Amino acid sequence: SYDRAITVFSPDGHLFQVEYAQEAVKKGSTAVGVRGRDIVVLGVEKKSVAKLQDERTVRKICALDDNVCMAFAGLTADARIVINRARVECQSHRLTVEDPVTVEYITRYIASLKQRYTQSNGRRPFGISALIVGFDFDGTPRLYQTDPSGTYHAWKANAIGRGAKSVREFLEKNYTDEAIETDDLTIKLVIKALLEVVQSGGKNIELAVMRRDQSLKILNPEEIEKYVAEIEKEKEENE
Amino acid sequence: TQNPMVTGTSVLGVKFEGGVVIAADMLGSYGSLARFRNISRIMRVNNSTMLGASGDYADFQYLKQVLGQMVIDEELLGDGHSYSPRAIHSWLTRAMYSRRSKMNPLWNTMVIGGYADGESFLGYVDMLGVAYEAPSLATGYGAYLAQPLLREVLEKQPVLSQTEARDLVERCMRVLYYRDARSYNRFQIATVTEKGVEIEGPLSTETNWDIAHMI
Amino acid sequence: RFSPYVFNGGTILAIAGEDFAIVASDTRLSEGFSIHTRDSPKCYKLTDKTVIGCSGFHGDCLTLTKIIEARLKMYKHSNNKAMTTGAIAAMLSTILYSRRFFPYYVYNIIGGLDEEGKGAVYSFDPVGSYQRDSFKAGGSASAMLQPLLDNQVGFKNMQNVEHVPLSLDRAMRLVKDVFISAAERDVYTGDALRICIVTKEGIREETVSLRKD
Amino acid sequence: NQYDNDVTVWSPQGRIHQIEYAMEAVKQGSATVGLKSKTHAVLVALKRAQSELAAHQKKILHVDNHIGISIAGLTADARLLCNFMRQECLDSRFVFDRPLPVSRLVSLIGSKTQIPTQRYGRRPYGVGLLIAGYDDMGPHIFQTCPSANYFDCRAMSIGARSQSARTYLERHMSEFMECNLNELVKHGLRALRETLPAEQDLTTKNVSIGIVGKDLEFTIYDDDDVSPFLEGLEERPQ
Amino acid sequence: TTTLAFKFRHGVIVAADSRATAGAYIASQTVKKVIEINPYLLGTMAGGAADCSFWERLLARQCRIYELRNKERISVAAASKLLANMVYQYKGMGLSMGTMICGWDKRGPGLYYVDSEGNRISGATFSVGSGSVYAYGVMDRGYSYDLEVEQAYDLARRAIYQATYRDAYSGGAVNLYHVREDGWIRVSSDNVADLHEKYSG
Amino acid sequence: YDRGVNTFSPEGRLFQVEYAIEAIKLGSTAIGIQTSEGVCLAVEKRITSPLMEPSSIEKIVEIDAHIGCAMSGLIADAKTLIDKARVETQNHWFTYNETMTVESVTQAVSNLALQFGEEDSRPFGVALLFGGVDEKGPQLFHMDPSGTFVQCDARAIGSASEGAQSSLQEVYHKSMTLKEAIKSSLIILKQVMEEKLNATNIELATVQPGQNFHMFTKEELEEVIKDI
Amino acid sequence: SRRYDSRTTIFSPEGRLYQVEYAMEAIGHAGTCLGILANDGVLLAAERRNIHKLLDEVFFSEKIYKLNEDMACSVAGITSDANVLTNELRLIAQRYLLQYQEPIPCEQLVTALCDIKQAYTQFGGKRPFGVSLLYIGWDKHYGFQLYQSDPSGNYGGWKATCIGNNSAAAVSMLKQDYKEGEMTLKSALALAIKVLNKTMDVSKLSAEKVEIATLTRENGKTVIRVLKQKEVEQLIKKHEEEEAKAEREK
Amino acid sequence: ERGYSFSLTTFSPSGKLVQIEYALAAVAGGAPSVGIKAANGVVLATEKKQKSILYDERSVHKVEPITKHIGLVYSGMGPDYRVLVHRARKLAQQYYLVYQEPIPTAQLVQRVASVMQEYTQSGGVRPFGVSLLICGWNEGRPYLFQSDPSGAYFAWKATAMGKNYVNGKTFLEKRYNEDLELEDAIHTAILTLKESFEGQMTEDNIEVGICNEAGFRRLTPTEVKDYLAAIA
Amino acid sequence: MEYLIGIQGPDYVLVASDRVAASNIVQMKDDHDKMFKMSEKILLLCVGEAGDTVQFAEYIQKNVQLYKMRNGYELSPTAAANFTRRNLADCLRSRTPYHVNLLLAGYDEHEGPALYYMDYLAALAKAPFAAHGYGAFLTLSILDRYYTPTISRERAVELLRKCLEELQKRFILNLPTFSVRIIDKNGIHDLDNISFPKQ
Structure with a gap:
């Protein structure tokens, strides 16, 4: 081991590494997510492929159990470690008590791991921030986010990655309980939020959902094209 | 130690x-x-x-x-x-x-004798941890053999003198020399007072065999 | 070869009164067909309201007594107050199961006052279970003493015999009667009797002789 | 000043400065006074408070049936050495079935604090011990230091502005050996009322007194059995 | 030693004897065997006193930890699983423990049976102990699902009476516990002699 | 790196403990008051977004059936402390059939408040308010990162605690009642907070000897707020 | 003792990472490799570092490491630093086979190696593996594959990969001359010959400076063809006849 | 010790490892050597000048066998050299325990280079300033393997390490060729070593070991004075 | 002890355990289930020391799902069978061995259906029809005269009936109810509970 603390306090009471390593998450890929009344919707942006290469392995949205869904930001490797760890953890919860794993339990695990990983002797803390979406107790739709400190924090919608202030400021107008709460309009208006990215190529959009009883479904850019077309149609109808 | 190789025998205090x-x-x-x-x-x-x-x-x-x-x-x-x-x-x-x-x-079977601060002491320690205080201790076969002499005289008289005790120990050791197969006619007396600790030399006994002239 | 246990015998009595816990024990320590002493009181006065008796293998009794005294001092030096009786009982149960796979060969009886100020006798077993009873007879003389207490304390198998609460002095003469009657037929009993009385005012002790054989 | 960093570094003048810093940190605790008779060892401390409403931080704490210690400095290291102290008492209480003589216990304490002043990676203990006990040769008033150069005295006084208290101890160390408990205790607070500025007076709630005697178990008192001790005084000669 | 438990429409009935001998010698007639784990769980003492006592106390501690971490009551099957996992680690080392885990679940009625051999199983009726087979006989005579409250009380009480009448290792008072949906309640504690006078004619 | 983990001062105490006492200050404020009728306790959640669901933010957690808590500053270090304190109270019950009293709880916490060590890790960055009901009635306890644990009658922590302690010393006495102390506490709350006071800002936690369970008030808090 | 610590893992004064970027720049000054899109088959290209005339060349492999029976890998960077990884990698694949008796499906292999690398990225505070390295291979679940490990532990499945400053322009040629559908190994070899003809400064491309190995599926086998020199020679003559075909436009 | 366990060798902004480059420079400031692989055998030869006339040439031996058929020389510092020699000895004997067969030189170089690579990365220790020249006649074809402090290795037809090793190398490239015998290799090796050494060169200044297919051989100063008495 | 049969077909695997959970005298539970649905085409049956059965099922059933989540697809029956054999063979030479008797029923896309057969000493077997327990002394010869490799599933269910009818005629145990599964190109389909009125 290394008898050296990375996490010494500041002269004025801060941590030079935790709130500082959040900036790695700030310099990462953007990913949003909301919970509807029955269907949950999330997705990442900035595929940024070489337009000749593969992307079925660069998938940033994964699952731990059949009921929970993942996301992250920052750098991908720490996310890979946390994901495999959490898969092992939720399957070991299945080895214990025979319920499907609640979202709150697995987020407590993730945040606790990250915290005691920051507390230990000379270890670089995980520069990620996950989004943990699931609906388990009678299908009650939830989503929690993490923090590199390890403070799980339950939301109703979320914005991370590059320019999340602008995304939450689009959400500012997009906070309506109406929002007319179809599944298609919720998905397409989350797609409008992700199309409020700083480049908005339209084709770099990667979105996937869950109907709170089914499993993960990856979409196709022709229904996304229809959603972009009807968004532009509503933008014409407002004029 | 599972198997005791070289044994002593009974101790009297x-x-x-x-x-x-x-x-x-x-x-x-x-x-x-x-x-x-x-x-x-x-x-x-x-x-x-x-x-x-x-x-x-x-x-x-x-x-x-x-x-x-x-x-x-x-x-x-x-x-x-x-x-x-x-x-x-x-x-x-x-x-x-x-x-x-x-x-x-x-x-083992150990006997601790000490005198400190006005009060005497005579302690017993077993192999199994059984440990107590007693006015007269006897180990080995002595707890069968010389223990009744001790308990006779100590019941008939609660306190003693040094001479009475020393003579009584001599008699008990004579008896242990009579009917114990792991005994020997050579012993030492060790005595503590407030004047210190003293080990006397390798004393012996006076035997009697007048029963042998009967058939 | 080496056998790790030996049976010393002994007799511990306890009677849960209304506002008193009487624990008495003989002071004969023996082994097989010999007599090691005629003074070894099985009782021990822990607090002002708790008396424990320990019979069986004597070395384990001593070791257990010292460990209980140590943990008493630890609780006091940590928590600024004495234990209750039932807390001591639970702690002893934890200890006796903490040496489950090399057991103590020791019977145990904790008497003493509760936090209300009433009698409370907590029986035990070698393996570490306990319960709150009104009387137990521990050691070698258990079967010689339990039915007489069933007749006298429990008023059991009797007809039209109403229930008077057991007074102090009547319980005292009961203990003296049962120890004489048990010292007649048992071999592991006699030569003294150490009678411990827990009141709301302290611990009283009392020594009454027996037959010397 | 660059050699003035760690415990391991010697000075080019030989005075390892970490121990000096630990001494000065011990000086910024609460004041305390310990003094013995031929038959009674009394230690008297003073409490402070964080604010008006809060209770006072306690100093005189129990150890064993014949040992009570005062303290000055940090409280975490205090409770750590308190745990070790109680442990070392009850260990010999288990094995030898006797209470410990005080001097060998304080030797164990000095040997305990020797290691974190000697290697690299530990600090000395900010600690202010005043130990009172009873072996067969009567009361003893020992003190320690973070350098573990523990002393036996007849009356010490460590903490804030304790030097005038030591002058009081000097001018009555002849008187101390003879008297009984009452005027002994009021000599003790006749040191502590000079550990205070003169524009205020020692009240009840801030003061605490621990007595052990050759037949007396060590007992702590606060305001109720100290109200008898606080009467029997006059004002200061203003 | 004779315990039984069966669930039905109105919850769970748990009754037991109170006799715990020692070889051929009765120690006490009033050994309270049904160990009250929680205000929603009830455990038993089936074979060995100390083992049942200790491990059920440890399970209670564990469940209270669980509830304080999740702000939520544990299930019955979860407690059975935890007890089985804890007991399994001392296999062959000489633990005798055949207890029963009862309680109300999010699913509702729950009745599990955990051995020191680790035979963790659910079920509808169970009976543990030496005279358990007698309880099996008279209970599976009288058992249904659609029984009433007083009917179930009489079934369990009659069962323990017959068991203590035939087998020798059982006797003493007959306790009687009743798990409802919200909490468990002690029904009564009846002596054998009273039942003998009542049911002999 | 500027005289770090294990070094005293030329004049005074340690560096990093002083930095921890500085690091408390950025946290959200909280006020506990001991009344003989029962301990009341309050906190401010400091909620930023309408997405930020209020009832998921924990400040008052529940140690035992009769022991509350309150925290400051950092979060998950306090969560680890809460976890271990719960485990130790349950162990005390397991080996004693009773309740680990509030002072024994806080001693079991402060025994490793300062066990920070990277060799042979960092000190914890949270100040804690403890409230419980022992056999000596109610108790209110205040600890710190430095382990210097004391009994407080009515402690105020965290941000703006200077004026909080002052104006709290203005109204307090020994013979207060419960509801008076509750409204007097939330007055100080809405004087030290910056937002309007409504149903989602604060949360109350009251423990009584007769009301040992449910050390909380839920949406009767709205009725309590509107009475000012 | 604590004034001898390096940075070893810590984030910047500005938000970035130190050893990771320096590991990438350690990669950049190494040999050049690439792999091609072939539906049946897959290939590797490699450049000879140290082409001095007094070597032996009796190892038959300077960059390639036939790691399973159905997988090899090229490599770029510090050599024995990578040889440690080859040893551990073959070990991990072989203990997979010990556990299942079915060959390794190669992506969990790649994640295993990446986790080995990442475990020295965060804690462990040692010199990180400044080696990126390729992957060719075949399976039952996708067929022929291509992968790109990085010292970060991030791994990308490409269809035409990337090595550093010597090969950034190669990837530019790969995009400007992207192919799709033609699984023909020989057109891919002509393509790779063209790529290394531009990128390497070896004038007129003598075959001693290069190294090519392929992996084709033969009837139950997936043999790994570390091909000899004469076919490379006639491949070069083929490519320079294609250069003559290119200058038919003059 | 404490077990501080961090490595001193980390990456530059250029991406280099300056301690390893300094260790290579420290190797290059060492004693010259020459090793030539002929058609049937391999010749090793070092250059050993004592500091005074007081030293003895019967105690320290540069040229060293690892098995009965594997010679090994170096150019660097003997205190590190003896360590890794002993390590290679124990390693080769572990191989001969497992397989009951003489270990091949490639396998030696794999394992030794892995150990040396491990010392380059592990905590706090300096790398070893030794450049080996390992060789042996395993299965007919003889081999010649140079290693380095960086943990890497190679395979040369002929090479040199030490003072003016580039000058010796440039003489080797013109003089040496692919096919000779052991005697001609000894001849050109003594030529290229005597190109760079001091003027007084005797039977004790040099130390020559050859590698027959009959095994490793370490020649005596008797046959050296037979040969190096004005070999051309 | 108890019973379970393992008949393979051309494109289906017909397994059938019992529902008996007795303890040495009495039948404590007469609807017990010994079936652990590992994957969408892989079943597992267990027989032996009932403290070991649940534990080893808890190991395998919660490790294969981990493989499923990590790799994004499903094991072969072959690799799963070998993995179980590996874990038994590692667990055998320890202070804590397992005494279980498994048989694994799988279905590949490529290999199609597959049956394996374990033993308390961890032996692999690729059997056409396996059994376990005491029943296995009769019910294999009741079967080995009417087996055809190209047999249809209704003939197979009939042969189960014909075999259970000869089981409950000359056998000291009770065994009243047998549960029956089947595997196909779709997955695990449960057939009806096969019990018998004897007389």
């Missing part, structure tokens, strides 16, 4: 007025062969307490070593505080219990 007399013999029999007929089975600890043991002699040597080390250590503290005899009794009891708990018994 009894209090009196301001002193405790302990006396055992000087025999090192192995099996039935009296292979070591000149050994000392009594350690004279520093100024007050005094030890006598039975069973395997090697374990007695070991405990003799460890106690000598500890007593020397407290004497090198240079503070003026020593061990009471009952403290030695406590430490030896905890030692024997710790040995038997780990399935490594120290095959």
Whole structure:
């Protein structure tokens, strides 16, 4: 081991590494997510492929159990470690008590791991921030986010990655309980939020959902094209 | 020790007025062969307490070593505080219990005699950790044989003199010489007072055999 | 070869009164067909309202007594107050199961006052279970003493015999009667009797002799 | 000043400055006074408070049936050495079945604090011990230091502005050996009322007194059995 | 030693004897065997006193930890699983423990049976102990699912009476516990002699 | 790196403990008051977004059936402390059939408040308010990162605690009642907070000897707020 | 003792990472490799570092490491630093086979190696593996594959990969001359010959400076063809006849 | 010790490892050597000038066998050299325990280079300033393997390490060729070593070991004075 | 002890355990289930020491799902069978061995259906029809005269009936109810509970 603390306090009471390593998450890929009344919707942006290469392995949205869904930001490797760890953890919860794993339990695990990983002797803390979406107790739709400190924090919608202030400021107008709460309009208006990215190529959009009883479904850019077309149609109808 | 190789035999101790007399013999029999007929089975600890043991002699040597080390250590503290005899009794009891708990018994039967601060002391320590105080102790076959003499005279008279006690020990050792197969006509008497600790020499007994001229 | 246990015997009595816990025990320590002493009181006065008795293998009794005294001092030096009786009982149960796979060969009876100020006798077993009873007879003389207490304390198998609460002095003469009657037929009993009384004012002790054989 | 960093570094003048810093940190605790008779060892401390409403931080704490210690400095290291102290008492209480003589216990304490002043990676203990006990040769008033150069005295006084208290101890160390408990205790607070600025007076709630005697178990008192001790005084000669 | 438990429409009935001998010698007639784990769980003492006592106390501690971490009551099957996992680690080392885990679940009625041999199983009726077979006989005579409250009380009480009448290792008072949906309640504690006078004619 | 983990001062105490006492200050404020009728306790959640669901933010957690808590500053270090304190109270019950009293709880916490060590890790960055009901009635306890644990009658922590302690010393006395102390506490709350006071800002936690369970008030808090 | 610590893992004064970027720049000054899109088959290209005339060349592999029976890998960077990884990698694949008796499906292999690398990225505070390295291979679940490990532990499945400053322009040629559908190994070899003809400064491309190995599926086998020199020679003559075909436009 | 366990060798902004480059420079500031692989055998030859006339040439031996058929020389510092020699000895004997067969030189170089690579990365220790020249006649074809402090290795037809090793190398490239015998290799090796050494060169200044297919051989100063008495 | 049969077809695997959970005298539970649905085409049956059965099922059933989540697809029956054999063979030479008797029923896309057969000493077997327990002394010869490799599933269910009818005629145990599964190109389909009125 290394008898050296990375996490010494500041002269004025801060941590030079935790709130500082959040900036790695700030310099990462953007990913949003909301919970509807029955269907949950999330997705990442900035595929940024070489337009000749593969992307079925660069998938940033994964699952731990059949009921929970993942996301992250920052750098991908720490996310890979946390994901495999959490898969092992939720399957070991299945080895214990025979319920499907609640979202709150697995987020407590993730945040606790990250915290005691920051507390230990000379270890670089995980520069990620996950989004943990699931609906388990009678299908009650939830989503929690993490923090590199390890403070799980339950939301109703979320914005991370590059320019999340602008995304939450689009959400500012997009906070309506109406929002007319179809599944298609919720998905397409989350797609409008992700199309409020700083480049908005339209084709770099990667979105996937869950109907709170089914499993993960990856979409196709022709229904996304229809959603972009009807968004532009509503933008014409407002004029 | 599972198998005691070289055994001693019974030890006798009894209090009196301001002193405790302990006396055992000087025999090192192995099996039935009296292979070591000149050994000392009594350690004279520093100024007050005094030890006598039975069973395997090697374990007695070991405990003799460890106690000598500890007593020397407290004497090198240079503070003026020593061990009471009952403290030695406590430490030896905890030692024997710790040995038997780990399935490594120290095959012994030990007697601690000390005189400190007006009060006499005569302690007993078993192999199994059974430990108590008593006005007269008898180990081995002595608890069958010489124990009734002690309990007769101590019931008929609660306190004693040094001379009465010494003579009575001589009689008991004569009797143990009569009917014990692991006995020997050579013993030493060791006596503590407030004037210090003293080990007398290898004394012997006066026997009688006038029953043999009968058929 | 080496057998790690030996049976010393002994007799411990307890009677849960209304506002008193009487624990008495003989002071004969024996082994097989010999007599080691005629003074070894099985009782021990822990607090002002708790008395424990320990019979069986004597070395384990001593070791257990010292460990209980040590943990008493630890609780006091940590928590600024004495234990209750039931807390001591639970702690002893934890200890006796903490040496489950190399057991103590020791019977145990904790008497004493509760926090209300009433009698409370907590029986035990070698393996570490306990319960709150009104009387137990521990050691070698258990079967010689339990039915007489069933007749006298429990008023059981009797007809039209109303229930008077057991007074102090009547319980005292009961203990003296049962120890004489048990010392007649048992071999592991006699030569003294150490009678411990827990009141709301302290611990009283009392020594009454027996037959010397 | 660059050699003035760690415990391991010697000075080019030989005075390892970490121990000096630990001494000065011990000086910024609460004041305390310990003094013995031929038959009674009394230690008297002073409490402070964080604010008006809060209770006072306690100093005189129990150890064993014949040992009570005062304290000055940090409280975490205090409770750590308190745990070790109680442990070392009850260990010999288990084995030898006797209470410990005080001097060998304080030797164990000095040997305990020797290691974190000697290697690299530990600090000395900010600690302010005043130990009162009973071996067979009577009361003893020992003190320690973070350098573990423990002393035996007849009356010490460590903490804030304790030097005038030491002058009081000088001018009455002849008187101390003879008297009984009452005027002994009021000599003790006749040191502590000079550990305070003169524009205020020692009240009840801030003061605490621990007595052990050759037949007396060590007992702590606060305001109720200290109201008898606080009467029997006059004002200061203003 | 004779315990039984069966669930039905109105919850769970748990009754037991109170006799715990020692070899051929009765120690006490009033050994309270049904160990009250929680205000929503009830455990038993089936074979060995100390083992059942200790491990059920440890399970209670564990469940209270669980509830304090999740702000939520544990299930019955979860407690059975935890007890089985804890007991399984001392297999062959000489633990005798055949207890029963009862309680109300999010699913509702729950009745599990955990051995020191680790035979963790659910079920509808169970009976443990030496005279358990007698309880099996008279209970599976009288058992249904659609029983009433007083009917179930009489079934369990009659069962323990017959068991203590035939087998020798059982006797003493007959306790009687009743798990409802919200909490458990002690029904009564009846002596054998009273039942003998009542039911012999 | 500027005289770090294990170094005293030329004049005074340690560096990093002083930095921890500085690091408390950025946290959200909280006020506990001991009344003989029962301990009341309050906190401010400091909620930023309408997405930020209020009832998921924990400040008052529940140690035992009769022991509350309150925290400051950092979060998950306090969560680890809460976890271990719960485990130790349950162990105390397991080996004693009773309740680990509030002072014994806080001693079991402060025994490793300062066990920070990277060799042979960092000190914890949270100040804690403890409230419980022992056999000596109610108790209110205040600890710190430095382990210097004391009994407080009515402690105020965290941000703006200077004026909080001052104006709290203005109204307090020994013979207060419950509801008076509750409204007097939330007055100080809405004087030290910056937002309007409504149903989602604060949360109350009251423990009584007769009301041992449910050390909380849920949406009767709205009725309590509107009475000012 | 604590004034001898390096940075070893810590984030910047500005938000970035130190050893990771320096590991990438350690990669950049190494040999050049690439792999091609072939539906049946897959290939590797490699450049000879140290082409001095007094070597032996009796190892038959300077960059390639036939790691399973159905997988090899090229490599770029510090050599024995990578040889440690080859040893551990073959070990991990072989203990997979010990556990299942079915060959390794190669992506969990790649994640295993990446986790080995990442475990020295965060804690462990040692010199990180400044080696990126390729992957060719075949399976039952996707067929022929291509992968790109990085010292970060991030791994990308490409269809035409990337090595550093010597090969950034190669990837530019790969995009400007992207192919799709033609699984023909020989057109891919002509393509790779063209790529290394531009990128390497070896004038007129003598075959001693290069190294090519392929992996084709033969009837139950997936043999790994570390091909000899004469076919490379006639491949170069083929490519320079294609250069003559290119200058038919003059 | 404490077990501080961090490595001193980390990456530059250029991406280099300056301690390893310094260790290579420290190797290059060492004693010259020459090793030539002929058609049937391999010749090793070092250059050993004592500091005074007081030293003895019967105690320290540069040229060293690892098995009965594997020679090994170096150019660097003997205190590190003896360590890794002993390590290679134990390693080769572990191989001969497992397989009951003489270990091949490639396998030696794999394992030794892995150990040396491990010392380059592990905590706090300096790398070893030794450049080996390992060789042996395993299965007919003989081999010649140079290693380095960086943990890497190679395979040369002929090479040199030490003072003016580039000058010796440039003489080797013109003089040496692919096919000769052991005697001609000894001849050109003594030529290229005597190109760079001091003027007084005797039977004790040099130390020559050859590698027959009959095994490793370490020649005596008797046959050296037979040969190096004005070999051309 | 108890019973379970393992008949393979051309494109289906017909397994059938019992529902008996007795303890040495009495039948404590007469609807017990010994079936652990590992994957969408892989079943597992267990027989032996009932403290070991649940534990080893808890190991395998919660490790294969981990493989499923990590790799994004499903094991072969072959690799799963070998993995179980590996874990038994590692667990055998320890202070804590397992005494279980498994048989694994799988279905590949490529290999199609597959049956394996374990033993308490961890032996692999690729059997056409396996059994376990005491029943296995009769019910294999009741079967080995009417087996055809190209047999249809209704013939197979009929042969189960024909075999259970000869089981419950000359056998000291009770065994009243047998549960029956089947595997196909779709997955695990449960057939009806096969019990018998005897007389």
